[model samples]
Target: MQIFVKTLTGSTITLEVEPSDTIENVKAKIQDKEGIPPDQQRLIFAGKQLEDGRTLSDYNIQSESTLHLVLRLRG
Candidate 1:
């Protein structure tokens, strides 16, 4: 499945992931593409924060779904 990822900075990216792929896996991919650490990424879909332990299928994510990515800033 393919999902659209939007960053808080207004940048957007598309990801190809499997139904069994965990949110953490997606985050790792995002980190690779965006240069943001996985630990600093906060993913939200359908107005809910996505859990790393959950798979895309678990969240009922479909193709063309949009995920909001927020980068956590350290103080």
Candidate 2:
């Protein structure tokens, strides 16, 4: 399925990954694309932060659905 991830930085990324892709794997892909580290990645779906190791199916991500990514930063 294809998902659209939008960051707080006004960056939107799209990934066509398998429904079986782990949340961590998806995070890794986002990191690779947007240069965000895994530890700094936070995915918000349905107004909640997604936990690690959960598959895409765990969050009920359907095809063409969009998941917003909010990167946690320490100032």
Candidate 3:
């Protein structure tokens, strides 16, 4: 399955993910493509925030789900 991760800066990152992939895995993939840290990535799907330990299938994400990625700045 495929998912979209949109940022506040009007940029969208299309990542090819799997239902077996965890939230943190997706973040790690994003870090591979871009520089965003996995620990700082927060994914919002269907008005709910996805937890690190949760899988894509856990949230019923079949395909083409738009995930709003919020980048939390490190202090």
Candidate 4:
């Protein structure tokens, strides 16, 4: 399925992902496209934080699903 991802900077990208793909996999793609490291990415969908080991289907993510990407800020 395809999903829509929006970054903190208001940039958006559409990715083709599998329901079995882990959130980390998604983050890896986002990192490739946005230059944001997977470790620095925080993904949210349906008002819930997506974990690295969790698959998209685990959260019931479907086609056209929207994911919000927040960069991890450190001092």
The candidate that wins on TM-score is: 4
Which regions of candidate 3 deviate over 4 angstroms? Answer: none
TM-score of 3: 0.89
For residues 47-68, could you state the per-residue lDDT of candidate 2 as single tens digits? Answer: 8888888988988988877788
TM-score of each: 0.92, 0.89, 0.89, 0.93
TM-score attained by model 1: 0.92
After superposition, the stretches of candidate 1 with alpha carbons farther than 4 Å from their true spots are none
- lDDT by residue (1-75, candidate 3, tens digit) is 788888878888889999999998998988898788887778899898899899999988767788888878771
Predictions in order: lDDT: 0.90, 0.85, 0.86, 0.91
In order, what is each prediction's RMSD in angstroms?
1.4, 1.6, 1.3, 1.3
Which residue ranges in model 2 land beyond 4 Å of their true spot? none
Candidate 2 lDDT: 0.85
Clashing pairs in model 2?
Answer: none
Query: Candidate 4 lDDT, tens digit per residue, 1-75?
Result: 899999787978999999999999999899889888887889999998899999999999999989998878760
Candidate 4 Cα lDDT to native: 0.91
- TM-score-wise, the better of 2 and 4 is 4
Q: What is the lDDT of residue 69 in candidate 4?
A: 89
> Distance from true position, residue 7, model 3, in Å?
1.9
Candidate 4: stretches off by over 4 Å: none
